[PDB]
Ligand binder design. Structure first.
Ligand SMILES: [Mg+2]
Lengths: 92, 482, 485
């Protein structure tokens, strides 16, 4: 089964806040889902290569030609917090 | 106890392409924050990565220059992590199929050369920039997405000095490929160092540290020197072992603990679905291989075995491709090999450093430089006069001969013309001539002065003096006139 | 001639023959929306002002005899995860409520070029995760055939708006059956083309290796006409296929005598309801009556479609949705103080429960120690599922089966049951896993609710799918029922 620490670890990796209630919920929610996911273990994948790209296509490259960036005002248009032409966030 | 110092270096090189790695925006930007971005760099909902063709070719070229095995099948992977300068919350990089693998470079530290293996070279994008300003940080994504190649060495480095030597050679080889300017002061060359000590006899290591903020070749060696000693003391003091991330302090020369890594950072690496796989065929590899010029090691070998130049000379002259090309172009113009080597290593490099200016950005040319060297070779121009002409030639170009005479710096040393000055001096200074025969004072000094005036400060001091004395001595005679 | 129930094909003719002005076409559309959508609730942001303006432009072109475009004057509804420059695109999430894009998605660039008229955006499950559209942060779309039933998901709005006679065409997106399942539930035609057939540039990503935009219409031919307009290579999407031939109507009308149809035994397996099973078996007989050769085959790894899909899509989502941090756009938690809180609070407050559930599971599936056992294992299973089809296509032209295991279920019946709702993707997920094209057309009704028939084809063989689907459609369809709802 899933431990509390492991749950909090996943939430941190995903950058999601989690409360005591939610933590226990996911503790169980996780198994119910893992048991569901474990259905894949019934498939025989011996010697089988994983599929990363479903499409048979390779070498799609873009010529190195620069295209001017958009105006600063447009790049910041949808940002909630900005200052001096930059995105503003709590100290890093 | 005795211990083995194991060091590994993680280097990043900025490719000087026109556009970004997975975005069409410019790789070079101005001063206005967030003026060099597009929806891709901004990680807008729905955007996709479009890999830069030249970036791949250049990554391949660099890998080949490092003697690596070039992948046939290669792809990109997402390195997942949240950070303000990494908008997508993942950096597109390469995990298990890097462009290059298992290369190496030879270095010189003490006596025999040592081969340092280079595990891999892979492509990825750079992050944006975050500046503090009080209790908050400001994010500028102009640099986000710029092309980077990561070069990880095998952990074969055994001392801070070796680390410096590795970096110097690596920098030189990459500089020759022309894919980057690789300058730490400008950030086009970056290096993080990883070090840990192992007491001889057993296999366990003491604490391991990742060193950050090594912004120069000297700070790298100095950071490692201090860390190696700190770790030695910890080893002897039985201090706790662990994975540390420390930042070097330039104003102190020490390393400060940034964090005590617990476990391992989980980047949830997985193959990037948005970029189709790379299938690097023979023709492609052959095409790129043909763009690689003679590299440092091969050139200095010739300078030593063929030109007979000292190992020192061969090393300095091949530090950069431009210096090497200039040297070769100058000696082909008939300039003495040894003299050309000396001027490039000394006067030229000295001039370049003093004016913070690159060789090809001066007015010096293999032609006008060889010209100057020839004048010093035949004795027409002294080293002292050379110190006056060279700077003028480098600054405004032209030709040594012309500069020398158009300034009255031509020294007269041929006994022929010098005899003319001497004879004129004797005829025009009869009283002094006799004063000499009578030792009435400083006749010799006076006569030499007149010649210096007559020759406008060109006559060879030592030679005038000698010729003067000779002729004066032959004349212990006399006469009269009204 | 309230043209709300006219086909794309017929509407085109009406406009070209100058029997109606584009401006009046648009008036009819908004009248329909005002009258019917309060009930159906398929639309989110409407673009009425711009739509009226565009129609005036087209009125002029009509007058001057300069009516260029594959969809000249044709109204369109667009799923809200498809970027529309200057028009609110929310993905039905609080995370992007009020979000106005500053660029244009490729499919929209193409549709505007063919002169279609943008009517508005359509409701969907939040960030395309779900099979009923009930997770929408804004409203719960209902099934036009039964208002107590769900319209399917995640493209519920796209299916409903078309079935309800609001627009003649809509675009949806399909990651695990998100276009086909709702088309099946709402009794309309829905195609998820071959992976790479339609650009993903401008499609807010769910699962990059599975997602694909596709059209929903009231008939097969209208569907092919629309696919023709949105398909094609795109320099902005490296996964878009370099296939310039986008002629999908050329085979429509030709017979299917001798066509080799494969019926997988697993597609009529235990999880398929009796009424759906009966309708599909009758459809198989219809296919035979038309001259097709229908024989049973086996796609043995079918049962793994749901879990492989779930793991892969969730993992990819745990990466594709990581850009949402409230920094550059979208929801920004006002009460966050530290950087960690900004990320965590903006994401926990901005994302709905199902979305966070999937992000969590995906993050876990990719985490140290579980990666091989979950994510990578699923990618190997995906290979097996693709191999199943390859073997069948060596001897058969197309694959047929039900689109969904049951008719649409009730609103509120499976919404608090995550496990249960995914069961509805039994027959659709293998298609995305294999990257194949798949189209759903109605083949019957049970208690008034539509049943879908699915045709799966070879890579880029949408022409053949439309050919067989059209022939089946000549025998059974709901063309006359729509206008009667
Ligand atoms: Mg790196």
């Amino acid at each position: 089964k899933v431990t509390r620490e492991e749950v909090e670890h996943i939430a941190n990796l995903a950058r999601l806040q989690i409360s005591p209630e939610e933590t226990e919920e996911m503790a169980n929610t996780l198994e119910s889902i893992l048991d569901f996911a474990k259905q894949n273990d019934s498939a025989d994948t011996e010697g089988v290569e994983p599929t990363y790209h479903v499409l048979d296509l390779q070498n799609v490259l873009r010529e190195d030609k620069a295209i001017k960036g958009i105006p600063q005002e447009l790049a910041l248009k949808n940002a909630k917090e900005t200052e001096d032409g930059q995105f503003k966030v709590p100290t890093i | 106890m005795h211990f083995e110092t194991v060091i590994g270096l993680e280097v990043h090189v900025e490719l000087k392409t026109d556009s970004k790695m997975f975005s069409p925006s410019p790789a070079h930007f101005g001063a206005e924050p967030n003026s060099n971005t597009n929806v891709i760099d901004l990680a807008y909902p729905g955007v996709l990565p479009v890999v830069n063709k030249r970036a791949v070719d250049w990554a391949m070229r660099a890998a080949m220059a490092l003697n690596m095995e070039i992948a046939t099948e290669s792809k990109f992977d997402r390195k997942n992590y949240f950070y303000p300068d990494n908008p997508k919350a993942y950096q597109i990089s390469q995990f298990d199929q890097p462009i290059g693998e298992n290369g190496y470079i030879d270095i010189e530290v003490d006596g025999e050369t040592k081969r340092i293996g280079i595990t891999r070279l892979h492509m990825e994008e750079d992050a944006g920039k975050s500046t503090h300003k009080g209790e908050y940080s400001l994010v500028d994504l102009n640099r986000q997405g710029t092309p980077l190649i990561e070069i990880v060495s095998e952990p074969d480095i055994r001392s801070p000095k070796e680390a410096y030597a590795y970096l110097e050679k690596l920098r030189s080889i990459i500089q020759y490929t022309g894919v980057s300017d690789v300058k730490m002061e400008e950030g086009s060359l970056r290096c993080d160092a990883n070090i840990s000590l192992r007491p001889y006899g057993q296999e366990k290591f003491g604490t391991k540290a990742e060193l950050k903020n090594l912004n120069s070749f000297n700070y790298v060696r100095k950071g490692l020197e201090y860390e190696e000693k700190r770790q030695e003391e910890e080893l002897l003091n039985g201090g706790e072992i662990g994975q540390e991330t420390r930042r070097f302090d330039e104003s102190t020369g020490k390393t400060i603990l940034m964090r005590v890594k617990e476990g391992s950072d989980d980047y949830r690496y997985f193959p990037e679905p948005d970029i189709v796989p790379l299938y690097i065929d023979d023709a492609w590899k052959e095409r790129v291989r043909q763009t690689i010029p003679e590299l440092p090691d091969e050139r200095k070998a010739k300078y030593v075995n063929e030109l007979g130049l000292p190992a020192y000379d061969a090393h300095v002259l091949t530090l950069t491709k431009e210096m090497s090309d200039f040297f070769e172009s100058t000696i082909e113009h008939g300039a003495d090999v040894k003299l050309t080597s000396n001027w490039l290593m000394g006067g030229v490099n000295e001039y370049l450093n003093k004016n913070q200016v690159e060789l090809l950005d001066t007015k010096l040319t293999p032609e006008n430089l060889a010209g100057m060297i020839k004048l010093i070779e035949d004795g027409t121009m002294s080293s002292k006069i050379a110190k006056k002409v060279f700077p003028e030639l480098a600054a405004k170009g032209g030709n040594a001969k012309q500069i020398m005479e158009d300034n009255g710096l031509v020294q007269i040393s041929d006994e022929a013309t010098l005899l003319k000055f001497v004879n004129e001096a004797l005829d025009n200074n009869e009283q002094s001539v006799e004063d000499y025969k009578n030792g009435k004072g400083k006749a010799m000094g006076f006569l030499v002065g007149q010649i210096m005036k007559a020759s406008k400060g060109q006559a060879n001091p030592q030679l005038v003096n000698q010729l003067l004395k000779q002729e004066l001595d032959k004349r212990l005679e006399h006469h009269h006139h009204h | 001639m309230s043209i709300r129930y006219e086909s794309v094909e017929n509407l085109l003719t009406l406009i070209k023959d100058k029997k109606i002005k584009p401006s009046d076409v648009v008036k009819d559309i908004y009248d329909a929306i005002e009258e019917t959508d309060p009930t159906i609730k398929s639309f989110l942001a409407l673009d009425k002002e711009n739509a009226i303006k565009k129609a005036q432009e087209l009125d002029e072109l009509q007058a001057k005899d300069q009516m260029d475009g594959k969809l000249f004057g044709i109204p369109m509804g667009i799923k809200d995860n498809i970027i529309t420059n200057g028009l609110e695109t929310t993905c039905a999430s609080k995370m992007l409520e009020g979000f106005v894009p500053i660029y244009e998605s490729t499919v929209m660039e193409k549709l505007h070029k063919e002169n279609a008229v943008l009517i508005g955006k359509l409701n969907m499950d939040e960030f395309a995760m779900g099979g009923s559209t009930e997770t929408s942060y804004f409203k719960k779309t209902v099934n036009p055939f039964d208002h107590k039933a769900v319209p399917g998901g995640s493209s519920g709005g796209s299916a409903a708006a078309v079935a309800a006679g609001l627009v003649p065409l809509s675009l949806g997106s399909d990651t695990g059956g998100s276009i086909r399942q709702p088309a099946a539930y709402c009794g309309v035609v829905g195609m998820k083309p071959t992976y790479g057939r339609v650009s993903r540039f401008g499609l807010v990503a769910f699962a990059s290796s599975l997602d694909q935009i596709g059209p929903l219409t009231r008939n097969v031919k209208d569907n092919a006409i629309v696919l023709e307009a949105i398909s094609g290579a795109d320099v902005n999407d490296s996964t878009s296929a370099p296939v310039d031939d986008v002629d999908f109507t050329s085979e429509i009308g030709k017979d299917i005598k001798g066509l080799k149809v494969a019926l997988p035994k697993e597609y009529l397996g235990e999880g398929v309801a009796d009424d759906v099973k009966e309708a599909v078996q009758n459809a198989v007989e219809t296919l035979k009556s038309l001259g097709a050769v229908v024989e049973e085959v086996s796609l043995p790894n079918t049962k793994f479609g749901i879990p492989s899909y779930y793991v892969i899509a969730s993992s990819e989502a745990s990466s594709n949705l990581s850009r949402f941090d409230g920094i550059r756009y979208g929801y920004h938690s006002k009460e966050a103080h530290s950087l960690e809180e900004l990320y965590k609070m903006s994401r926990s407050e901005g994302f709905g429960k199902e979305v966070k559930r999937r992000i969590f599971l995906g993050t876990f599936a990719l985490s140290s120690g579980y990666y091989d056992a979950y994510y990578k294992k699923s990618q190997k299973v995906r290979t097996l599922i693709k191999n199943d089809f390859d073997k069948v296509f060596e001897n058969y032209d197309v694959v047929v089966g039900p689109t969904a295991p049951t008719t649409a279920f009730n609103l509120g019946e499976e919404i608090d049951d995550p496990l249960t709702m995914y069961a509805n993707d039994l027959l659709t997920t293998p298609v995305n896993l294999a990257g194949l094209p798949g189209i759903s057309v109605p083949c019957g009704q049970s208690n008034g609710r539509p049943i879908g028939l699915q045709f799966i084809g070879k890579p880029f063989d949408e022409k053949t799918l439309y050919r067989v689907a059209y022939q089946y459609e000549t025998q059974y369809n709901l063309h006359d029922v729509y206008e009667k709802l």
